[PDB]
Design a protein around this nucleic acid. Structure first.
Lengths: 103, 67, 89, 58
RNA sequence: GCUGUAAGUAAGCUUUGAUCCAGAGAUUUCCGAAUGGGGAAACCCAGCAUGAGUUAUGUCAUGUUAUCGAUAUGUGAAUACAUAGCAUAUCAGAAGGCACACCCGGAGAACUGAAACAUCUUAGUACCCGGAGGAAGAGAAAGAAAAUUCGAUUCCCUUAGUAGCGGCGAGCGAAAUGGGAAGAGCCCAAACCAACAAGCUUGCUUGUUGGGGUUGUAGGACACUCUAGAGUUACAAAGGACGACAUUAGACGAAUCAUCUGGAAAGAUGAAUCAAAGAAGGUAAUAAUCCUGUAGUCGAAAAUGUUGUCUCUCUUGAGUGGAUCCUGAGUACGACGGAGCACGUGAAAUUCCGUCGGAAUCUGGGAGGACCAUCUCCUAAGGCUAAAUACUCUCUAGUGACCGAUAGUGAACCAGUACCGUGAGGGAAAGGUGAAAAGCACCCCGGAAGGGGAGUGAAAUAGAACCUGAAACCGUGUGCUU
RNA sequence: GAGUAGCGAAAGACGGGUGAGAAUCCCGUCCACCGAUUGACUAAGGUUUCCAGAGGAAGGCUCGUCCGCUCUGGGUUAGUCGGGUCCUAAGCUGAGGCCGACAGGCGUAGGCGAUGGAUAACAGGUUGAUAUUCCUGUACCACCUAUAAUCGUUUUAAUCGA
RNA sequence: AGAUAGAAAAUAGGUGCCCGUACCGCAAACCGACACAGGUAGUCAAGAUGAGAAUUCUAAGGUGAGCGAGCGAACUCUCGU
């Protein structure tokens, strides 16, 4: 499981071996939209809300099973564990020490 | 926000219920006349009146049961 | 009470033809009487009403998509105040 | 329709014929209406004639 | 992060901890046993008390008011006491519902089988109503038997399709013994009693006040002499006070990378790793190492079942004589008619109901399949009693040489719904775009429906009636024929 | 079967307009049919079919620019009209009660129940849709409050009454 | 019968609730599966002719019937001679 703004690598899809920062989480379909990932080409029609339209290139969501956090020390894809610092479930990179998720 | 409400005496509380009921009327009279825009104010005052009546019940029920 | 019975005002061509005159139209609760209405309005707006008339509208069929429904039953009251002006701004 | 005292009530059985052909029947008690002493005040009630054989006060 | 489905666009909310998830609480319109009176459910129309309002009237709010039942007060007839009867007060008293099950009763068919049919069978079945209880019924020998004892009952296996019953037809059909599951025993009436307590006149009688002891080695009083464990599942019957696991939220939880083909790999190939975890489901294809988990471990504020105790509450245990006394009455039992016993009235025990009769009290009574005499066993006519046993509307976890959309529920999908019937009732048809909605910007013909390009996508004879797309059937070409 | 039967009693014609499209929709003229009714009301029943815009897939036995169709927004105003409120018939319920295997049946007092009895508003105007309902005019029936011009043992009264 | 110190009188002010009310109703909105040649209680119901609520034409007021255009064979149907 990953966080709202951390930097992750992708291992599925046309995009692998690529980094990018997560921008949205969507916790009820288990799907995140990372940055650059899954670029989409959506045909938007000229309406009232949108004066004109075109082919927008927005990012689409991918299953959480396709992304991984990087070791803050060695930038290597890694799993994530936990430890009880003062009773708080804080995260660990599982190959090194503490991993920070502030934004 | 029910802390200060517990801090409030049972009297102006019934008066707060009264005033919030008045406000609600005005909001829904203006939603109908199409001059509201802030349509979520209705739910916040509905919250407020709900909490105010729950506190009012708790106020009288402690007394009823204990003496 | 006296504010819970006036659900909304009514703004429509026939109600506004009645606002050219001093007749104002409201959508009132379905379990009130003319008496309870007069009192409520003269309590809120500080007006003095002369008469009021009530009518009950039946639930109307409304088909939304593939699911049929019925609209809610309505009770409407018409006031004809002599002293005052209910302003609906 | 029971006996006030005992409880002798009716019962079902069969009327059988010479060819053992069966029909439903009933057997009732010899219930007689008698004024006895009940709950203090005298009252008329049905009581069997076997309960009146010995023991009841009219 | 959220504001359900269910999309929306708009106001918002949320690390000062939202939406969630568990426990507890508050609110809970109207109808419905429906209960103030009515009524064509979901509505009308009230009386009383208290309050709001109004100068008042109209109007409104909150209580209260059904019927039986039980009890307690008044008041009280035809009637003199009295009794009906009335009037109050009280009472978490009763109603109604249901799981289409299991259980015990009341009442009880027929088609059918007999190759017809009436006895018989179907069958004490179906359907009715009445009780229930989570289980129910049964249950501590007036028993089985011929050695003696399951020494209560129930249930399973076998006895055994035997013994038997049967227009001896069609059919119906045990029990004991023996092998097992589970086991547990008790309380009252009676005598008698210092008394008590009323009648009745203290002579007695009768009472629930209470004790007393409840059983065949015949038990108990009696008279002697003698001595202070139980238990709320029967065995009286209430409830605080400490713990113990478990259950109605949860927490932690090992170990994989590279290339190849691809739209995407979990595949193939190579090299690793973990395993108390290679159950399972997801993931753009087929994953022990990506995710949710799994083995393992941990964990409740609370509200519950449950259980150890500590309280607590109850409280006599024997022997020996045996002179008297007591041991369940309209009862047993007999007769008549029926029913029940596997047993159709039969030689017909054993047992119950209606109707008439009608006993004994231990020096007695019942049973041992007509039966008796003798022997053996038992001690009725009062009561309570857990376990093994039956069933699943539910809830929790899981399983399946069970079904995969004409199947499997009638119902995978807003289904007991369209619909049909006056009504009981009857009762359907209908799943699948893609990985992602990326759901086809623009242009062209057309009023629009459609279409044709361009673009999205791996694919658009995957374009929303959307996966695959057979046959019947309908067309458009034509090679060879007529 | 077959592009076959049928297209559900009947008088239409034509000018103008509307539209992508017109025997079929709108307006007009003429003609024709009913007229103890195909006219006006009002019950029962149906429930929104009512009105104004808009649309044309489907439903209309053809067509359709039209509609009892679809989409959007509207529309029913009562002290006096009909009911509730007042009364009761036929029936239905029925406390206690009678009878009943259970279930329940019957029935008194009393209630319910119009198709009947008793009850105070008429005319005109009015919109796209309502009008003894709204408005203008004039009324009437109950009820309450203030006042009363003197009714007068408050038994009788100005007069209160089962 | 009781009940009671009160309002009638010649005024002037106020108060009067709930349910129904659109629309069709001899009908394409109802009972007949249908925009069905059937059924559907009651009220008003004009002129000419007549005895008449008969009959023919018409008034008030509604309506031209949800398929048509041809040709006028056989044969059916309805009608006249």
């Amino acid at each position: 499981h990953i966080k709202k703004g951390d930097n992750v690598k992708v291992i599925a899809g046309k995009d692998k071996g690529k980094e990018g920062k997560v921008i949205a989480t969507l916790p009820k379909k288990d799907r995140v939209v990372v940055e650059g990932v899954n670029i989409m080409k959506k045909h938007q029609k000229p309406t009232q809300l949108n004066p004109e339209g075109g082919i927008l290139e927005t990012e689409a969501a991918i299953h959480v099973s396709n992304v991984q956090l990087l070791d803050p020390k060695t930038n290597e894809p890694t799993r994530v564990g936990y430890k009880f610092v003062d009773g708080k479930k804080v995260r660990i990179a599982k190959k090194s020490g503490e991993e920070i998720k502030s934004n | 926000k029910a802390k200060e409400i517990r801090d409030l005496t049972t009297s102006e509380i019934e008066e707060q219920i009264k005033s919030s009921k008045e406000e609600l009327f005005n909001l829904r009279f203006q939603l109908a006349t199409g001059q509201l825009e802030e349509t979520a104010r209705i739910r916040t005052v509905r919250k407020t009146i709900a909490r105010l009546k729950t506190v009012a019940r708790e106020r009288e029920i402690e007394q009823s049961k204990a003496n | 009470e006296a504010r819970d019975i006036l659900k909304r005002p009514v703004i429509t061509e026939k109600s506004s033809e009645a606002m050219a005159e001093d007749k104002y139209t409201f959508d009132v609760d379905t379990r009130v009487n003319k008496t309870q209405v007069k009192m409520a309005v003269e309590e809120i707006f500080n007006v003095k009403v002369a008469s009021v008339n009530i009518m009950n509208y039946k639930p109307k069929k409304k088909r939304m998509g593939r699911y049929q429904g019925y609209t809610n039953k309505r009770r409407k009251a018409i006031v004809t105040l002599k002293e005052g002006s209910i302003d609906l701004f | 329709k029971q006996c006030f005292v005992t409880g002798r009530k009716a019962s079902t059985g069969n009327r059988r014929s010479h060819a053992l052909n069966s029909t439903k029947r009933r057997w009732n008690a010899n219930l007689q209406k008698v004024r006895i002493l009940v709950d203090g005040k005298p009252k008329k009630v049905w009581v069997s004639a076997r309960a009146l054989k010995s023991g009841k006060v009219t």
